[model samples]
Target chain A: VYAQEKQDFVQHFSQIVRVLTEHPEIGDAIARLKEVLEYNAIGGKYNRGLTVVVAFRELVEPRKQDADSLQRAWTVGWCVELLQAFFLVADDIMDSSLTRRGQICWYQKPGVGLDAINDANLLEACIYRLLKLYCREQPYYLNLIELFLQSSYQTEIGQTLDLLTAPQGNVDLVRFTEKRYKSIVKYKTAFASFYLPIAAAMYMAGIDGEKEHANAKKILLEMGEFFQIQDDYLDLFGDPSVTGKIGTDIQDNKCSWLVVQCLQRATPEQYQILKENYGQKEAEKVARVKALYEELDLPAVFLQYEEDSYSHIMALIEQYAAPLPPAVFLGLARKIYK
Target chain B: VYAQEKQDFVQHFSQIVRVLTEHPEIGDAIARLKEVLEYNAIGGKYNRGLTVVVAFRELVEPRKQDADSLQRAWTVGWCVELLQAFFLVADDIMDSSLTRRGQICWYQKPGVGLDAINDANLLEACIYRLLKLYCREQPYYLNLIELFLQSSYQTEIGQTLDLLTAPQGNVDLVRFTEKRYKSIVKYKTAFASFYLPIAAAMYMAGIDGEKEHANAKKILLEMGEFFQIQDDYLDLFGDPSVTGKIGTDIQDNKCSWLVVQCLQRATPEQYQILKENYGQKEAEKVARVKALYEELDLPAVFLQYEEDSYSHIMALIEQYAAPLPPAVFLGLARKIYK
Candidate 1:
């Protein structure tokens, strides 16, 4: 559990939120930040940021018994959330997203499109500043900085791949294979979402085993990938009111899991329908694409795939759980699943 | 004088330039980066980047430093020029500029525009990464990083003012004034051009005297402002073949020194003429604005102003040249003039 200072946490957060939001000239920047922060960060099932506190709790052993240590853990935990906010904002812009977290994508909104890119960079820079401001005196400061930088480079490389393969205007159907999808999701989402928090916790607790960190990263990445596939399924089938947002991947030309699965399994006629209708803006075209997907029994296939992938991730988590804490992966999985 | 490792310095410099120029994909991230770097970076006076070496020589007294320090100094110096390249690329986009440094403006050349803003941010990030890689162990890394960040913020603020006052679509003549011109030059040009190199030198030498550095900054900033005003004077009056560039600020509705000066001195008839001709795309309309400027004796006023500004900057440099080495500021002025 977090320290009782969770009460004080609200004041600190509101201060940052207000500082960022109240600048009128920076309204576009704030909108992009809020969009990414709320959707990928807030609505997400992953309590990835909170996991930093729990992992730190275990790493410090008895040192976590004190109030100061608890406070440091919460501050570091929030840094993780801020890091996620940074990546998601840029990722949304890079991906040319239409909606995120069940709302209009920040860039797609009038007057604030590509300008969101600079705001995303600013979000990232804030993470480093916060680390230096709050944790500079901590023994783990250098370790935290290095881990975050490495994670950013990895995420950027992944984004580069995503951009190269599924370029905005030139949508090549061949590039949307399951392998590429898995790679993109793992690089873009898994590292920042799952591995980044645990790495921060390890640094905070002074636990620096290179091999063990690598193993944990591998397990977390698999789970993150599986979680993203489940997200793709929900986009097509989930209720808008309960989900609190409409999905537009069919119209948006996304390289989603459903498309990959349909391409692999669909018959010629169904494939023809999908190829023509998918990514078209017209409602009738989107409906036609959905119908063809149904005709291929793709929804059932997705359900089965989700179950298998979920179980596989669980098995990996079990293998790595002996050296690492089970709560790390299991808690992350619980956040992703509903 | 700088250590005479001239051959090694050239080799290292060439290698970095090749690395930057070869990886055009990085530029492709924004159209402006590609355009700006290709156009401006390749053919500039190269004085700004070279100042790093000059300032390093002047700062590291009892010179004839080792090969490593010399190499490091030149590398860091190139980073300064690279940072400028980034800013120019983005500014050109916001300014809707069609040419820069004797070449086509990055944003206007074929397919680069709003995306240039991201490339500019990337350029800023590269400076930090290079600092971490090459200079993190140095005593001045944090100082250099903070200085660069703060200067960037200042430049962006200045740009925001320029954009608001002279936005391409608005063209409201009310924004043109002498005070506004001073704000634009000081915020936009002063810090990055005049103070940037010397600030880097101070950091390298482990100088932490706040008062001395502030004085140095003040002198260099004045020089930068004068340098920009000279630039504005040259736009309309200087020969294109000699300057190796064509001036379009009149057509572009830029809030340049010439216009601001003319605004202050204009009679009612001249003001009416300016309102009709300024910002027009037609050649005759632009010529009419220049004709009004000529009738107001603007060229003679600019020459006198240029002489006064240069001498005033020299006097400030002389006043503060004791605590700070004169060579850094003097060499900076000398390089810009030629």
Candidate 2:
């Protein structure tokens, strides 16, 4: 049952694909879109997409959680994944990433290349189509649509700041401030990953209000920040044999939270080493950067930051989880903190 | 002021950019977005975007064309251009285009690279943001939003088929049928280029009727197809010294109307030469394709087709121009056929 929990949510994907491909005039191109959705959307823990259903179960009253309501929740769950797929597909191309979730990245896959750009657009368009098809008659249709749009815009802002902040083939320790890193994460990764799913669920549960959404977003962003910092931590410190992929943050010039901590604690000599060795592709240069990261004790630093983020996020959750239950926030919080 | 007819429509761009970049927390990334807007949005014919304002002037009565209404038309006109900018930025990346409007393609610019992918998404998000800022309170706000959303989805469908129908480095003349070329033109270029601007105006003027939109779209797509086929005709035939850029359709493996006509008319012996020489980059190979095109009398066929299309479009305009006015269609019709 634990493994099977995601089945209902996962099954809704085909219908979404069918509706998108139903217009035959689009021809086999729509068939390619179906493949795009399947390849990019199906993998991973699905923590973000599943968060909608998980949060909705706790937030909405059991009496009204009918077949129709659940279907909307599942479909919205899939929309969250579609949004993720769109961002990830484009992000992979921008980052020049080789693999995603243990498979070849969509852009890197043979015969795909830059055509993946429009495929990413198609993935984004799929979200609205799903929302319109399933939730059009609902009172929250427009509200739901705006939530996805706003999150999309926010993520783009994050991505813009990101590419500007930590450009590949170039290193800039000067711009790697913790404040800037947090800003990049909040816009680029947090809003869509942390806040959007819960926000969608809250809107669907008839809890749409500025005060409530603002409060939930505060807590959700805190969780999202934790999730990303954890991801940044895993990029380097996590075991490659277990993880099945080599980390590229140091080589690709990512504004990783660990790098920020390393910079803050580095001596002038240590800092110079980072400036020289940080963004190079040569194994020695990459190894040296990792070695400096170790000499500066970043893995331990992350553990401290991790515990603090987990504690601070809970404090915010306690303070802001109102009008809506703490359970909705708690459901999401426990998934990450553990 | 004969030359200044487009002044109002072009000038509204600053406010749109300011509103987008106003949030300082986004920091310099937003400033980069401002540059993206300026570089890509301006330098166009202003025909597509200005059409919204132009069509609105003809559709909405003079008494109702208050300063407020005119501003909305101009803003929508700019939104139409914003849509074009978004498409162009991404389309440049997808097509590996070198220049647009006599300037370097946004993606091809120094330091932009594939980062242009997210920039394109930002341009798209700007459309909805402008709609929300300018037209949110209007009665047809939802109608207008859906119109843009539908057109965006339609264009991506076109891009998908365009890529699939004629993949680079692998020429498939079998897929380049006239019907297929027309289908790609309609979805890829027609809806956004021809139908969208006027449709936005129609919604603005409270002309959001199904029959009117369907009929208007039928006429607009005809114009869009004509526009693209004309473009396809010009690719090889047009003088590069005069036009400022050489055509790559033959080498890029585009499903151009000219090539489709050639295929339809070619003998078995002639087709073998095409199958060899088409979609090749060597100067001799490209020249051979051109010679074959000339051999097949495509230039004469296109002139006949062009006149027929113009005559047929006018007949449709005469028949369908009702409950609105013939002039709105005529304004657009004259611009193209001329």
Candidate 3:
């Protein structure tokens, strides 16, 4: 249903890509801003970017006057994707990963490393510049700016906690429990990616009531966590190169959901295998750990967890649908899972 | 004379030092946070921090009702200093710096490297938290947040240009001409340090006119550039240890005023010596570069520049001081230089 809109989304993004690439005066000191932005921001199956436009469709009354507003929504939607690009670029550098979105990671490219941090900041600043350029005179401008700044701050703090708790070589498996993983995903990914779209919708609709926006935020954040748990499943089970990038959570010493679940289920021997094999960069060592995960039948467990989380979110949306539109929650759910 | 204020300044700064040292959790991950806030922030001679208190003095008039406002003002003023902390810390890291305010850079501390970027971000976030904790309910709260954010973006762009233009190997003696140096200093230093203080003063005074604020910004920024130019002069001419750190601008291939001036005045032989010897870490070779500077009388040129710049700023302040308090601009001038 949203395919046409998704294409339009890519087209607008292509325009931004062209603009960024054409302005290479950032010099060879910085990454090709166009490529980093395109890889991370543009070709995302774009559910989050579409979420803003879709939510606005649900909220606004159908009318000729609303067409310009719809275009504005699409522009702001792309801004959210751009913001996500900024986060991923910096995160990849911090995590020292090899690829993103089926391409070589921006930082892994020649002559890019620490400079990626500033490029990330520039990516972030561009969102504000676009907002001011296109949306500042709109009634919703201040609301949109405030929402973005708050979400970005939440994500940064989440990233801070993740960095502090999981500093390289300091990973104690005990720290990788389910509760902490949920907190990490909630702060790091959910706030910016999931709740941010719905929040934009609320602003665009002029629904400034705090209680109503809070109700929307509460549901989307839960969905965000669910989306992340599914990501953890894909990390190990999916084809590494076909999945567009090899998984490194093991070598990264991350407090990822897979490790947390393994710890919960591991027998003494299994635990020993994990301790020896975890965080080793050698492919053979990582394969051994993956083999243990297979014996544990973690894929079935992940499917059950995903289903349970999905239903729980549906029930909450049902419960809260009286005060807010059901389409907003259901629309978000549909975009994220597939 | 501001001598008594200087003593009072030391006493107030002692409080900041005590509180900061008490919380040591932010040492390496928060390297820029601790180092910049401690060094550049606390030792700032207290005018900016004190101005918030002074503005509160005007606001309360004869009554002077509660100690709450004064305490809050001091906290917010400290936030202004803290805002400067955020910019300088990251700027130092970006500038490939080794020292600031007489100590090894926060990034230079063992085990601290690009991680300082996030720490610099945290320092920026703390300003908002402090504002929310202390000033959120105040009418001026949003204004303060907006001021800090805009100033920060401007500074980041300035630093971006500085980084682009002054990469170590790319330092063409041709580009180090006067225009580039002024652009670097103005963007990198002027906005946050000079204009920000009076901008806060404008908000605290409840003067919201755009034109009036712009006038104040123009004058204060000019003063900020002057202050930084003096700093560039002090790097070579000031006592190394008394300046609280060693000077390594030449050794780091910094785009300093000394080199820019040297480039302007150098005969062919003098230019050759600078290219060969500038940025050499050896004590004797670096001394040879400074000796050439002496031969060129760059110090005398700097003294003349400072005098002319000071008079130019005073003249601008005279024209622009309007319904807004002249004391704010006068106060910034007094604090930055002499």
lDDT of 3 by residue, B1-338 (tens): 57674565356655554454342232322443455456456544566666666654554444543666666666777787777776766667655667766677777776555556666666666677677766777788778877887777667666665655555544466667677787777777788777776667567657778998788777877887887788878878998666765566776677788898888889999988888887666788789889998999988898898889888998997899876556756666666656
Please list the residue runs of candidate 1 whose C-alpha ends up more than 4 Å from where it truly belongs after superposition. Answer: A1-11, A17-118, A168-171, A227-254, A266-290, A321-324, B1-14, B17-43, B61-64, B99-122, B166-187, B208-212, B228-263, B266-300
A142-228 in candidate 1: lDDT tens per residue?
Answer: 678767766765565455445545443445677778777877777657787778888898878777888888888878888778767
Global fold similarity of model 1 (TM-score): 0.78
Query: Which regions of candidate 3 fall more than 4 Å away from where they truly are?
Result: A14-40, A64-67, A137-139, A240-243, A280-284, B1-47, B55-72, B101-104, B108-113, B136-139, B245-248, B278-288
Error of 3 at A302 (Å): 2.2
Q: Lowest-lDDT window of 10 residues in candidate 2 chain B?
A: B239-248
- Write the residue-wise lDDT of candidate 2 on B1-338 in tens digits: 42376787677778777887774557788888889888888887788987888789888889999888888788888888888989879987877777777767888888899999999999999988888887888999888888889899999999999989778789699888877887898899999999999899998989978998999987888889998888788778876555444577888888889889989999999999999998877989989988998999899999999899999999988877777788887877777774
For the predicted complex of model 3, DockQ is 0.22
**Fnat per model, in the order given?**
0.01, 0.74, 0.09
Clashing pairs in 2: A158-A188
Say which prediction, candidate 1 or candidate 3, comes out ahead on TM-score.
3
Model 2 spans with C-alpha error above 4 angstroms = A23-25, A240-246, B23-25, B239-246
Q: Can you rank all candidates by lDDT, best first?
A: 2, 3, 1
